[PDB]
Amino acid sequence: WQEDPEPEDENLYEKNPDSHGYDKDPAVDIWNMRVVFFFGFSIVLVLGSTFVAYLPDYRMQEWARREAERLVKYREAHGLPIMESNCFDPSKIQLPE
Amino acid sequence: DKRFLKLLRFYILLTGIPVAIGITLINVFIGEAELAEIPEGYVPEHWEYFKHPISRWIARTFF
Amino acid sequence: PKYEASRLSSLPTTLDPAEYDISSETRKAQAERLAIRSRLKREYQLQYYDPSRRGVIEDPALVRWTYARSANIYPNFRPNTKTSLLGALFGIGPLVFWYYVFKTDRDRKEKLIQEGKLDRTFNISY
Amino acid sequence: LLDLIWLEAILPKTISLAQMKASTLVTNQKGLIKLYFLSFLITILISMILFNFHE
Amino acid sequence: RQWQPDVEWAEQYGGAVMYPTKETAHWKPPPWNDVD
Amino acid sequence: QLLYITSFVFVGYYLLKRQDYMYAVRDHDMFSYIKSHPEDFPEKDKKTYGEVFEEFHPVR
Amino acid sequence: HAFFKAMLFMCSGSIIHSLNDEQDIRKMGGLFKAMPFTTTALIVGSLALTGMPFL
Amino acid sequence: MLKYIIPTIMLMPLTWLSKNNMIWVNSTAHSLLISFTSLLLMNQFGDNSLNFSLLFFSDSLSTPLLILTMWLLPLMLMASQHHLSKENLTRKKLFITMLISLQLFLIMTFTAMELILFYILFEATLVPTLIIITRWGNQTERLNAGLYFLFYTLAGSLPLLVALIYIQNTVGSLNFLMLQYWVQPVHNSWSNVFMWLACMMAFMVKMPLYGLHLWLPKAHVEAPIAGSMVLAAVLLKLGGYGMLRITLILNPMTDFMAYPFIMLSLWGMIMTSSICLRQTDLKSLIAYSSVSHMALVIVAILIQTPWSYMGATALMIAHGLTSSMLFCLANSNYERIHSRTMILARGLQTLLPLMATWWLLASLTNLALPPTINLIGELFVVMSTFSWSNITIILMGVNMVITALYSLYMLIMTQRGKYTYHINNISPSFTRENALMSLHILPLLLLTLNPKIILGPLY
Amino acid sequence: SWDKDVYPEPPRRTPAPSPQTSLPNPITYLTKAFDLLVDRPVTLVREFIERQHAKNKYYYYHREFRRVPDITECQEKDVLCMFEAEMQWRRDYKVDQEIVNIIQERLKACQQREGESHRQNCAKELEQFTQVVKAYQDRYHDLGAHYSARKCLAKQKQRMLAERKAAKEA
Amino acid sequence: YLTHQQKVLRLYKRALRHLESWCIHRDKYRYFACLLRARFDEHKNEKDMVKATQLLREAEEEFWHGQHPQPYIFPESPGGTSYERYECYKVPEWCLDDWHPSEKAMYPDYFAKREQWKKLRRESWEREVKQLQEETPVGGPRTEALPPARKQGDLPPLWWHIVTRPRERPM
Amino acid sequence: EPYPDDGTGYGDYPKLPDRSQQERDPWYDWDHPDLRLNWGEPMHWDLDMYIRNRVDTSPTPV
Amino acid sequence: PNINKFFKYLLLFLITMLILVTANNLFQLFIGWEGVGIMSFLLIGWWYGRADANT
Ligand SMILES: CCCCCCCCCCCCO[C@@H]1O[C@H](CO)[C@@H](O[C@H]2O[C@H](CO)[C@@H](O)[C@H](O)[C@H]2O)[C@H](O)[C@H]1O
Ligand SMILES: CCCCCCCCCCCCO[C@@H]1O[C@H](CO)[C@@H](O[C@H]2O[C@H](CO)[C@@H](O)[C@H](O)[C@H]2O)[C@H](O)[C@H]1O
Ligand SMILES: CCCCCCCCCCCCO[C@@H]1O[C@H](CO)[C@@H](O[C@H]2O[C@H](CO)[C@@H](O)[C@H](O)[C@H]2O)[C@H](O)[C@H]1O
Ligand SMILES: CCCCCCCCCCCCO[C@@H]1O[C@H](CO)[C@@H](O[C@H]2O[C@H](CO)[C@@H](O)[C@H](O)[C@H]2O)[C@H](O)[C@H]1O
Ligand SMILES: CCCCCCCCCCCCO[C@@H]1O[C@H](CO)[C@@H](O[C@H]2O[C@H](CO)[C@@H](O)[C@H](O)[C@H]2O)[C@H](O)[C@H]1O
Ligand SMILES: CCCCCCCCCCCCO[C@@H]1O[C@H](CO)[C@@H](O[C@H]2O[C@H](CO)[C@@H](O)[C@H](O)[C@H]2O)[C@H](O)[C@H]1O
């Protein structure tokens, strides 16, 4: 039955010893290497890392410590407990029964 | 293998070196902000609640 | 003191009674085994030594092994006393055993917490 | 034992066989007018006597 | 290369039904142009 | 290609008109009925979470 | 233990190198004068290991 | 989310209108730009999520998954473009369209408020993925793989549709913000036992849960490389993401309904790790590694503690890059020897030195070497499950021994020992392959410096 | 540079040098070498940077959150009130985590500072850590991953019920 | 598979090597090695084979009892401490085909001779296969032996991988 | 000799002696020397368990 | 021929020990704890062409 024979495993380095593995055409191959490297590494990985390193107080963890220090300073200076077992004022609650 | 590692090093440094220089000049010639009490009647912008100038700049521009 | 062969320690060939008493129909068997091995060795070498060959000399023996170790298992399965009991013993047995181990542990622990008996003085991370 | 055999059998392999046999029952029909309309009579009778769809 | 169906695979869908049984072993594919 | 775009928009505009009209009618009917049977739609007396009791279910 | 144990491995490495990567002591022997400095460090380390007073 | 949805859609005209020889350059370059802008999503707040509109919101859970999703599209393009080199042009553009459309559905799936909108897109990811497997897979068994994959998902996702629609009838909304304030407790009854199962079984099969996993090794062995990458890196995590959301409305019934699935996961992780020690197919070994790793995620979501949710979030992200890297490492060998048998090409470190370094680094993350985010996530789940029950440490400890065994066994078998004599077409690694590998491991290791951005809302 | 009341430090008591040997102290000469060769060039660099900072002085502020009604005052199913109440609870939850961190830092610093006398000399530090943890545990423990102000309020009301029941039985 | 002679000689060599492991000292080894040889000469001329086989089996039983549990192994023999130590440094010659031209430029003379070897291999292959064809019986070889070159100017069939194999100390 | 025809999915795959690859002759020139296998010879069902890095069945002096 | 890599592994092997020995918290200690274990694996298996070394 009429079916083409299986092709041959082509080696990119055979025709282009400088091949980057991106394309048969050397000119396209070099460009495809450059966009990957420049956008992949020089932009996203470097500038994205710097962007993450300088995020403005991610989820107010810095603010929370500053606020806690303000509350500890105030409470200990007014003879108050630093923290109470009750989150909500019992004056605002009515138990059943 | 050596060609790939030279290419990887070059492109990381292509923007890495300017950023390292840019961060250094900002930290040296601009510096961080000083914590102050909010003056009476003043309403700071949302980006003025952050210390580092790069963090403040991100707040203004994108957030 | 004879040699007690085990599963994980074979009988040495030099102590095997069948190793010495070599008849003739065993010589013919050995020669037929060497014939198969030499026929396959020649077939491999004509490709291994071929100067123009760049690739993988596909091994049907290796393909048969990887195939039997997966695709060929279910079509040869039959639910029966050995296969059902084995699947019964191990498919569900461990799951039930671990369920009662953990259920018993957590029941007992929750009981103490209700009675305020378990010690959680500094337990505030969970 | 578990994966390549029993976990297959208990679900996908048995469900596939059931539907295949239901399909043969449904579609293995003689193609005869007389038989199809006879089942219509049975369906109508069963609808009334057993399920009271007429009530 | 990528496997594509051959004749043996194709003939699985060329019969009068998909699941041959003792009952339907005498069925045949209808005529190509529906004319008998 | 221009007629394909135009025909869809022209027909689609009137389908969107009718769609929005039918949903307006549904709301009209709903609020009139609610207003005609105030006994079935009582303005309920709401409580605050301080007064309401909810069982606590510890996670541990 | 860090001092003399590391020396003992270094000394054995010296002998193993001199005997062409032979690590079996049955194939060694007669090295007391042939490898004087290795012999010295081997004796000192052995006496340090065995608790020779004031090592 | 429109600032990400629209540019994702524009990748389709960009690919179709590109010069015939520049389809891989254009799509890869501009998809990397989309990924760059995805970092703006990290404008998270301590108390509130980032609620863009009535359709889309992002919080600390969806944000890392969105960033991983958008990062993966360019990586998948580079991985695919070699084995598709002899495909005709139109069918290459269609392949890239299936990858772009998958990203479109994924970035809307992770950001939808409405659970029905989440359900619709969650289900729509089936069509591009099934097409990629069954059309561009190499083996005959890719058709069976698609069928198993399709009907496993639907068998569970159709009961979910009924359950979700029922919830909106009673509650009045499926918006996730409303549900946080209108959630009522789920009381015991056979009705709720089956509402719980309907709400959870669809996500369990995606994870997959042990016992409902057999579709996954089958699918990976048959899918192309891009199919394997998205399947392992993101498509598995839809089940984890859905559970983290849907468990909100199932308390307190989860207290006991979770036992059978914790038992399947705790025992299932040991079984699938042990199975990895005897797998002959390299891709199948990595597929069975995913089941063992996701077993921890299932237990972490089910026990519902702040530490386990943080572990689950880190585990899902960490596993995404590691498993995707491992599939790419296996593929690069396959593109040379055209077989998946692990014992075929041995001693590859002698012939491909740098590629062996990627194998070592991927293996060390797979076995959760500290302080990688693979261990950060795993350790957090172990700490939380010890408080759940102290005995769990035995099973988690055993799984860490076996996990190191098959991780290094894979490295030893393929990279070390003696090279196979008759295999003489092992060409040097291409820059495309080395770059593909470094774009997995480098971000994975960089996250060690700022783990908090992958720890989720409970951080 | 930090509030000495929030992060207390006892007064320092260094003994004076009191040699009993005629040999020179190598530490003293290395200390002078370190001062001249390391500390001095480091200090000059800093004063240069601190001078650039003086020319450009600008301020950032600590965000202050006005109090809003809490969950106890919210009517059932009123999302607009519930949202503000439950955002406030989360912010307080974050600050209370940081309060525990401050007290734990004081405890940990005392253990190291007091040396072999830490068990006796850190008694006050240990007591404060014990109390704040008890309060934190009462508030926030066992809520689960899907914690809210509502579940926290429910937990408190259960505690208040048992505490009332004990007093009645007293 | 071995013959009676081969089994006896193999047992003799194995017995002496284990005796060497026990004795250690060369003088003590030389003494007992001669006593062992005397045991083998007591039955050197035993022409009643069935008795000889009994002698061999009893000698192997006497060996298993008396073997050293940790005998000496030459460093590079299987089980030795240097066995396979250098396999990581053995690189197949076909790898040089994938060198960049700038790497091949550093060894102009070496890569010229390499072409002459590749040329010699190509021009030899056709005749090598033919010799094996006509020198092998009908039903494929009965043994693993290979023939020499039967004509001048012919190389022995299947020689490439024996001749160009890596060195024992390749680096 | 195939594995016994119980349910287990062996099919007709040969049952070969349960012996480690460490037991084979290390001096024969194998095609795969590290595995001590020849190209084409039938591979043990549990070969991946009997490689030289894993289970050993060599005779022991005791 | 890989003496350079051998010395890099020895230095890494020492660095992870000093992380272990100076760790003030258990997570940091674990980094050193696992680090020495990995460097042991890489150095013990230095001659990776040898099966007994990988084992
Ligand atoms: C490493 C390169 C990275 C590139 C990306 C970063 C680019 C931006 C770098 C920072 C730019 C300068 O950063 C910016 O400095 C000025 C300080 O004058 C601050 O601005 C503030 O102080 C100045 C006075 O100096 C006043 O106008 C006013 O009080 C206020 O606007 C900004 O809050 C800060 O964001
Ligand atoms: C529990 C939730 C998920 C449950 C999912 C259950 C639905 C079924 C999912 C799998 C769908 C497979 O659908 C169908 O199954 C049968 C096997 O049963 C496959 O058939 C395959 O197995 C049979 C029997 O081993 C072989 O004879 C056949 O050569 C092979 O093709 C079909 O190729 C496939 O089209
Ligand atoms: C949670 C419930 C999920 C329900 C999902 C329902 C999916 C149903 C899919 C179709 C089921 C029937 O599909 C059909 O099954 C049979 C048996 O498996 C397959 O048949 C295959 O196995 C049988 C028996 O092993 C062989 O006789 C047959 O030669 C072989 O081809 C068919 O190739 C497949 O087309
Ligand atoms: C009334 C409303 C009508 C709305 C229609 C809006 C779009 C109209 C498009 C008109 C231009 C079409 O352009 C026609 O098709 C393509 C792309 O353009 C061109 O040919 C193209 O080949 C390949 C794509 O295969 C591309 O590299 C390149 O874009 C171009 O060379 C044809 O040479 C041109 O004849
Ligand atoms: C990871 C990096 C991602 C890079 C993304 C690249 C695309 C960048 C898109 C930038 C969009 C900026 O869009 C515009 O920027 C200017 C400053 O220039 C801002 O300018 C304004 O910001 C804030 C608004 O609260 C105020 O201080 C004031 O109104 C003004 O400063 C605008 O708020 C914004 O409308
Ligand atoms: C992977 C598979 C996982 C399967 C998990 C199986 C979980 C089994 C859950 C059992 C609990 C079901 O819910 C249970 O229903 C019974 C009814 O029978 C309810 O019981 C209610 O009706 C019964 C009548 O039978 C009354 O006696 C009882 O007074 C009343 O409370 C319980 O309120 C509830 O506890």
Side-chain angles (χ1 to χ4, degrees), chain D:
Chain D
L1 181 66
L2 297 197
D3 300 344
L4 287 176
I5 281 166
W6 268 125
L7 287 164
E8 294 293 328
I10 56 175
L11 271 164
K13 298 299 222 168
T14 317
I15 297 159
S16 297
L17 184 63
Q19 309 321 332
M20 187 195 75
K21 293 193 287 189
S23 183
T24 47
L25 292 176
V26 168
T27 56
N28 286 11
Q29 305 293 336
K30 299 298 293 295
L32 295 163
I33 277 160
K34 172 162 158 162
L35 305 203
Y36 294 146
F37 280 95
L38 186 64
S39 79
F40 289 18
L41 174 56
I42 297 169
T43 285
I44 291 172
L45 276 195
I46 278 156
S47 287
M48 293 177 70
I49 294 174
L50 282 71
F51 306 126
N52 313 302
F53 290 154
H54 68 279
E55 274 171 7

Side-chain angles (χ1 to χ4, degrees), chain A residues 47 50 54, chain B residues 18-24 26 30-31 33 42 47-48 50-58 60-62, chain I residues 55-59:
Chain A
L47 302 181
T50 312
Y54 285 106
Chain B
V19 167
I21 286 165
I23 288 168
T24 308
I26 282 153
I30 290 157
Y42 186 71
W47 45 268
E48 292 176 291
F50 305 116
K51 182 183 220 295
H52 198 275
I54 296 181
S55 304
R56 291 164 69 101
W57 183 77
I58 282 163
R60 281 178 66 103
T61 307
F62 311 103
Chain I
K55 309 186 209 162
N56 171 28
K57 203 149 91 199
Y58 67 113
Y59 311 107

Side-chain angles (χ1 to χ4, degrees), chain B residues 12-27:
Chain B
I12 285 161
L13 298 167
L14 179 53
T15 43
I17 277 158
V19 167
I21 286 165
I23 288 168
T24 308
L25 297 175
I26 282 153
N27 282 335

Side-chain angles (χ1 to χ4, degrees), chain H residues 79-373:
Chain H
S80 313
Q81 64 172 98
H82 174 251
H83 79 90
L84 288 184
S85 61
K86 293 187 286 185
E87 182 65 26
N88 61 275
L89 184 64
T90 287
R91 289 211 287 267
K92 287 158 154 189
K93 296 173 172 192
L94 273 168
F95 174 92
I96 290 163
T97 304
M98 302 282 101
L99 296 185
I100 293 157
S101 75
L102 192 46
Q103 167 155 305
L104 178 60
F105 298 153
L106 282 168
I107 64 173
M108 304 200 269
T109 316
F110 289 127
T111 53
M113 308 216 189
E114 294 293 328
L115 295 198
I116 301 299
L117 184 62
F118 162 82
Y119 173 88
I120 278 163
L121 298 148
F122 162 95
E123 276 297 292
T125 70
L126 283 180
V127 175
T129 302
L130 161 65
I131 287 164
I132 284 157
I133 283 161
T134 50
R135 174 68 203 198
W136 282 284
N138 189 358
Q139 291 269 282
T140 293
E141 297 69 25
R142 69 188 194 262
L143 302 174
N144 282 331
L147 283 161
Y148 270 76
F149 165 69
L150 176 53
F151 288 110
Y152 262 88
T153 289
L154 292 170
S157 69
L158 278 168
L160 171 70
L161 177 64
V162 181
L164 282 175
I165 283 154
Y166 164 89
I167 281 152
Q168 184 178 2
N169 286 344
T170 74
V171 183
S173 198
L174 280 162
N175 187 286
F176 190 71
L177 298 191
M178 293 291 314
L179 286 174
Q180 287 171 265
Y181 304 108
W182 284 20
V183 60
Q184 301 305 284
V186 165
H187 302 298
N188 291 1
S189 53
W190 296 106
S191 293
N192 286 343
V193 162
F194 281 98
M195 191 207 60
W196 194 100
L197 289 170
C199 282
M200 290 286 267
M201 287 307 292
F203 305 132
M204 291 285 181
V205 62
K206 298 291 180 68
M207 283 302 304
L209 176 87
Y210 182 65
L212 300 170
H213 67 281
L214 278 296
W215 71 266
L216 175 71
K218 211 192 307 313
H220 271 296
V221 167
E222 310 292 318
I225 183 61
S228 287
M229 294 164 69
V230 75
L231 186 58
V234 184
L235 294 182
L236 292 204
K237 317 306 156 69
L238 285 166
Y241 173 80
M243 270 197 233
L244 287 157
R245 294 273 192 249
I246 207 74
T247 42
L248 165 80
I249 69 184
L250 302 176
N251 289 128
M253 179 156 264
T254 308
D255 279 15
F256 71 92
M257 270 306 278
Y259 274 109
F261 304 93
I262 287 162
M263 295 299 102
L264 280 169
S265 289
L266 286 174
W267 188 240
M269 71 171 180
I270 288 151
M271 285 298 104
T272 51
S273 294
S274 303
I275 288 158
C276 279
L277 288 164
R278 303 297 310 278
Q279 287 294 304
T280 73
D281 188 319
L282 188 43
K283 271 195 98 169
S284 200
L285 196 154
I286 299 150
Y288 270 105
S289 185
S290 279
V291 179
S292 190
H293 282 303
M294 284 306 103
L296 290 188
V297 174
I298 290 168
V299 175
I301 297 154
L302 285 175
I303 63 175
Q304 292 180 11
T305 73
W307 268 69
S308 81
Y309 268 39
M310 284 195 275
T313 316
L315 259 177
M316 280 195 297
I317 299 304
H319 167 271
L321 295 147
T322 289
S323 58
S324 189
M325 179 159 176
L326 282 170
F327 280 119
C328 284
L329 286 161
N331 182 245
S332 67
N333 287 341
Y334 178 89
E335 303 216 303
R336 275 158 182 79
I337 66 181
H338 310 290
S339 162
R340 291 183 302 280
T341 314
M342 181 168 58
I343 207 169
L344 177 55
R346 305 179 298 279
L348 289 175
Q349 173 167 8
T350 298
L351 309 181
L352 300 163
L354 182 61
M355 183 69 29
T357 300
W358 305 132
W359 274 99
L360 173 54
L361 280 182
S363 297
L364 293 180
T365 60
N366 191 73
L367 58 87
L369 191 72
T372 65
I373 56 158

Side-chain angles (χ1 to χ4, degrees), chain A residues 59-60, chain H residues 41 43-53 56-63 111-113 175-178 180-181 245 457, chain I residues 83 86-87 90:
Chain A
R59 310 196 65 191
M60 65 183 73
Chain H
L41 278 155
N43 176 27
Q44 291 313 312
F45 299 109
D47 48 354
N48 204 9
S49 62
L50 198 63
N51 312 308
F52 308 121
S53 62
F56 298 120
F57 82 118
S58 194
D59 72 345
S60 286
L61 175 56
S62 50
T63 293
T111 53
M113 308 216 189
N175 187 286
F176 190 71
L177 298 191
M178 293 291 314
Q180 287 171 265
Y181 304 108
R245 294 273 192 249
Chain I
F83 171 70
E86 191 276 331
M87 289 303 112
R90 293 181 184 271

Side-chain angles (χ1 to χ4, degrees), chain J residues 64 67 69 77-78 83-84 144, chain K residues 26-28 38 52 59-61:
Chain J
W64 198 256
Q67 75 190 307
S77 309
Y83 185 60
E84 290 175 323
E144 276 191 358
Chain K
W27 292 111
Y28 176 79
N38 263 6
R52 291 167 58 216
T60 52

